[PDB]
Structures are given as C-alpha cells and as structure tokens.
Design a protein around this motif. Sequence first.
Motif, PDB file in Angstrom:
ATOM      1  N   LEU A  69      -4.478 -13.825   3.413  1.00 57.21           N
ATOM      2  CA  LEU A  69      -4.330 -14.101   4.834  1.00 57.21           C
ATOM      3  C   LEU A  69      -5.637 -14.613   5.418  1.00 57.21           C
ATOM      4  O   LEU A  69      -6.716 -14.128   5.070  1.00 57.21           O
ATOM      5  CB  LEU A  69      -3.880 -12.847   5.592  1.00 57.21           C
ATOM      6  N   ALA A  96      -7.788 -11.276   4.611  1.00 59.64           N
ATOM      7  CA  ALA A  96      -7.169 -10.058   4.120  1.00 59.64           C
ATOM      8  C   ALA A  96      -6.215 -10.411   2.991  1.00 59.64           C
ATOM      9  O   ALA A  96      -5.891 -11.579   2.763  1.00 59.64           O
ATOM     10  CB  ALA A  96      -6.440  -9.308   5.240  1.00 59.64           C
ATOM     11  N   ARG A 123      -2.377  -9.118   1.439  1.00 59.93           N
ATOM     12  CA  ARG A 123      -1.165  -8.347   1.674  1.00 59.93           C
ATOM     13  C   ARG A 123      -0.398  -8.216   0.368  1.00 59.93           C
ATOM     14  O   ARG A 123      -0.174  -9.212  -0.327  1.00 59.93           O
ATOM     15  CB  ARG A 123      -0.289  -8.991   2.752  1.00 59.93           C
ATOM     16  N   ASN A 138       3.066  -6.458  -1.483  1.00 61.78           N
ATOM     17  CA  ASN A 138       4.358  -5.794  -1.408  1.00 61.78           C
ATOM     18  C   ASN A 138       4.803  -5.401  -2.808  1.00 61.78           C
ATOM     19  O   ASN A 138       4.660  -6.176  -3.758  1.00 61.78           O
ATOM     20  CB  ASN A 138       5.419  -6.679  -0.746  1.00 61.78           C
ATOM     21  N   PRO A 196       4.752  -3.623   3.376  1.00 56.78           N
ATOM     22  CA  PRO A 196       3.609  -4.308   2.755  1.00 56.78           C
ATOM     23  C   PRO A 196       2.282  -3.739   3.236  1.00 56.78           C
ATOM     24  O   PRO A 196       2.117  -3.405   4.410  1.00 56.78           O
ATOM     25  CB  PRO A 196       3.786  -5.767   3.186  1.00 56.78           C
ATOM     26  N   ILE A 228      -1.831  -4.087   3.788  1.00 48.55           N
ATOM     27  CA  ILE A 228      -2.844  -5.089   4.102  1.00 48.55           C
ATOM     28  C   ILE A 228      -4.218  -4.469   3.893  1.00 48.55           C
ATOM     29  O   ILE A 228      -4.532  -3.423   4.475  1.00 48.55           O
ATOM     30  CB  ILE A 228      -2.698  -5.619   5.536  1.00 48.55           C
ATOM     31  N   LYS A 279      -8.173  -5.616   4.255  1.00 45.45           N
ATOM     32  CA  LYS A 279      -8.994  -6.661   4.844  1.00 45.45           C
ATOM     33  C   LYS A 279     -10.263  -6.885   4.033  1.00 45.45           C
ATOM     34  O   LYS A 279     -10.794  -5.967   3.406  1.00 45.45           O
ATOM     35  CB  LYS A 279      -9.356  -6.310   6.287  1.00 45.45           C
ATOM     36  N   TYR A 318      11.147  -8.753   7.934  1.00 43.87           N
ATOM     37  CA  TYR A 318      11.454  -8.122   6.662  1.00 43.87           C
ATOM     38  C   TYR A 318      12.762  -7.356   6.816  1.00 43.87           C
ATOM     39  O   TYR A 318      13.209  -7.077   7.933  1.00 43.87           O
ATOM     40  CB  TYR A 318      10.328  -7.179   6.215  1.00 43.87           C
ATOM     41  N   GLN A 377      11.675  -0.095  -0.498  1.00 43.92           N
ATOM     42  CA  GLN A 377      10.821  -1.159   0.006  1.00 43.92           C
ATOM     43  C   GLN A 377      11.585  -2.054   0.973  1.00 43.92           C
ATOM     44  O   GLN A 377      12.816  -2.028   1.047  1.00 43.92           O
ATOM     45  CB  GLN A 377      10.264  -1.998  -1.147  1.00 43.92           C
ATOM     46  N   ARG A 378      10.830  -2.851   1.726  1.00 39.33           N
ATOM     47  CA  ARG A 378      11.391  -3.883   2.585  1.00 39.33           C
ATOM     48  C   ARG A 378      10.944  -5.248   2.080  1.00 39.33           C
ATOM     49  O   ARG A 378       9.788  -5.428   1.687  1.00 39.33           O
ATOM     50  CB  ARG A 378      10.990  -3.680   4.054  1.00 39.33           C
ATOM     51  N   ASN A 388      -5.554 -10.076  11.356  1.00 43.09           N
ATOM     52  CA  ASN A 388      -4.752  -9.552  10.247  1.00 43.09           C
ATOM     53  C   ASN A 388      -4.361  -8.091  10.460  1.00 43.09           C
ATOM     54  O   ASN A 388      -4.295  -7.302   9.515  1.00 43.09           O
ATOM     55  CB  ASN A 388      -5.467  -9.737   8.906  1.00 43.09           C
ATOM     56  N   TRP A 421       4.919  -3.811  13.902  1.00 47.10           N
ATOM     57  CA  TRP A 421       6.283  -3.712  13.401  1.00 47.10           C
ATOM     58  C   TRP A 421       7.221  -3.250  14.504  1.00 47.10           C
ATOM     59  O   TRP A 421       6.912  -2.303  15.235  1.00 47.10           O
ATOM     60  CB  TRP A 421       6.363  -2.746  12.218  1.00 47.10           C
TER      61      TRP A 421
END
Lengths: 356, 112
Positions: free
Chosen positions: A54, A93, A95, A97, A104, A106, A108, B37, B41-42, B99, B103
Amino acid sequence: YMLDLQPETTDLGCIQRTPKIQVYSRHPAENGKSNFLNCYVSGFHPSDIEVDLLKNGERIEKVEHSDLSFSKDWSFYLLYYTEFTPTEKDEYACRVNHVTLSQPKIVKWDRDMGSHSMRYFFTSVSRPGRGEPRFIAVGYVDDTQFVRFDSDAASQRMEPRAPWIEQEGPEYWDGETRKVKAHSQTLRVDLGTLRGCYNQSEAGSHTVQRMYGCDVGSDWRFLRGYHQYAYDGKDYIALKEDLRSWTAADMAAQTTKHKWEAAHVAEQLRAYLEGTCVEWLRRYLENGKETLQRTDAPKTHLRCWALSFYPAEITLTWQTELVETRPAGDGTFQKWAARYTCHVQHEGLPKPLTLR
Amino acid sequence: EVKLVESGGGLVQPGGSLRLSCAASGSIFSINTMGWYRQKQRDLVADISSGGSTKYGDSVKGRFTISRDNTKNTVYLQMNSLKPEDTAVYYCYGLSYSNDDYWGQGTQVTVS
C-alpha cells in the motif's frame, strides 16, 4: 539436477498456521534515492495468501513476489517487493489476508527502522473444479534459488533463477523439465489417493509437500541426505538419516512404508542422495563460485542489528525478542533482536563479535 | 474518526441483482480506497481508489461492478447474476491516506 525415478516408484499405497509479517526496505531509506519495499510473510499454512503493498491508502500496481517455498516445519514463506523512491510525505504498508485471519492485517512501514547443500521443494495444492492442482517446484544451493517451475506459468519449462545455471545447454533443461513434470504428475495422483486414504470430501483443497536434497562439508564430501513428505502441513513419511528406513506418522503412512520397503524405494533414493545429488552440487559450486562460494559478513550496529550478510544462518543472543531472518531481495539477509551485550555468530566472521 | 454508512442489502432471487452503497463520513481528505469484503476469513469483493483504480476478487469478476462518486466519498457495488454462493455479510471498508483501515458493520445479502 533432480531425482529421476519412474512415477510408480513413489506411488502412495493406502493444522493451520498464521503468517508472520515484516515490512522493510532493501537498503536504508534515503529520500529521493530509489530502493525496494519488501513484505516478508513466513510461517503460514496453508499456502493460499493475499498480499498487497500500500502507498498512501491504495494498492501499488506492479508488485512482484518470490517463488513459493517452505521451511523445515513445512510452513511457507514468500517475499513481496516493488521498486520505490521514498519521499517525506509518502506512507507505505503491507496488507495480508489469510484463512487464519478474521480480517486482513495491515503492517505499516516504519521508515526510521563452510558446509554446502542442494535442496528441492515441491508443493501441490488441489483446486477442485478449477482444474489440475497448482504445482510449484524450486531448487536451492545453500540459500540461493537457482531453478523454478510453476504449473500456472506459460513456458511449462524449468526456468533459471541464478546466473550460473543459465550456462547449461538444452539437454540439461530438457531433462529437468521432463523430470519436474513427472514430479508434478506423481503429486497430483497422490493428492487424489490421499483424499481416499483419509475419506475426505472432493470439494476441499489439500496440500502435498515434498522435499529432498543433500549436504556436503567444507571438503565437498557427503554429510547427510533428506527425503521428506507431508500432507496438509503434517509429516506423512520421511526417510531416516541412515537413508535405509522410513519414518511413518500414522496408519496410512505405514501402508506406504510397507509398499516402499517391499519395492525397495529407499535404495533408489540413497543412490541419488549419496551420488548424483553430491556430484551436481559440486558442479554447481564450481560453476557459480563467484556467487555461491562467497561469504558476506553482517554489517552490525536495546536492538541489535545485522544486515547484508550471506549465508542466512546466524545467531543473535542478548546477555528478548528476535525476528525471523529475512531476505533483503538482492541475495543478502537481515536480522535484529531485542550491562547488556549482543553476541553475533556467523560463518563470515573470524570470531564471534560482541556489541555493547 | 470515520464512519461508514452502508445500505442496499437484503434478499434476492438467484440470477437477480442488488446495488450496495457505502458513504464515508468526515473529511473528503481522510479516505482513499473504498470497497467491500465478504464473510472465518473475509474475502475481497471489490475496491476502488480515489483515482478510480479498481480491483475485483476472482469469484465476482465480470458480474460485479464498483463505481465511485467524484464529489462525495461514496462508492456503489452493482452485483449482477447473483448465486447462492454469494450469500454473505458484505463489509464496507476504507483506507486513509496513512493506511489506516475503517470497517462498516456489514449488510447481509441472501440469494434464495
């Protein structure tokens, strides 16, 4: 130089880990100076993973990643990287998953911070309904990857990943391509077989892992051989250190053990591990002597830092939190650990150093 | 700091379509990427940056389309040709220009 057996010889007859994440640059960051931004994920199982780099709240477009490989405990590791020029305002950053994460994660980017071996790693992951299993094979000399094969890639050939292996002619690459496809066919059949031996549904995804190779000393003479197998990240069957008997983990592996003891599989493997593997390792060490026979001593400087060293094996002890050794992306490695002294043992050092 | 207001979920017949929408609160300077999403998990469905750069998950490519209002920090998800396997709670999310991820509570989508 891979093993060359018939597909029926290794015929089989019959736990999730979350990733550790590290975001860092290849070199110390200088504003206006081009660099590489790295995201290193390791220690995870299964191998399915989604990784983004990111920049200022959006996805970086051209991100590359290393070929999938795994550690001794069968957990996978990958390096995601991109070339970037950091400025004062930009923020970066990574990320990640994974099936082990409810959302997810993150991480940095904090801008302000002998013996030899040849190894082959094979991973086959079933994708029911989406086609044949995803097959990836990688070859190593010490901590340097030199060959690779991806079933999803276009070439359908074993490909070079080190400069010294590009010397080899078409006969070498034809044989390696032929052998690596036979490794793939064996693993695909084993995936279908293992689902039956464990009475599993045809809709789930499963992983099969295979590793083998040989070690030599500083005199380039044989030290130890390996041949290990795993299903869904758990030990299935492994060849013992004497290379004459098998270690089976459960009842299904005991049936394969008896089928392999009767068909004399271990004797065919010992000939490769003690002979062919050693022979071609010495050929690789000679042909890539400028690369493989080098040692880069760690540049060192409560957090003890060690940078730009090769090979990757190192020991950092305080007299505590130590991170996993990570690839810089240019062939070298990095590590750090957290009245007191820091001990640094490395092959490229005359004697252990001490940082106070 | 940032609040995400979701709307547009509910029940739909197989083959039907739905439009989800997500509106971000606060400054227009505080949110870059927005998207969804869906859900252990998603999985990524779709997201889009302030500049219009999109990304889609493999399982919805071709059928789902994400778009963005130029003025407000509001995104829309046009979900076409829905299947029972598309049933899930769809979470809106956003990324700040530093960053940080935000949600939403999520909207249930059920395909008969």
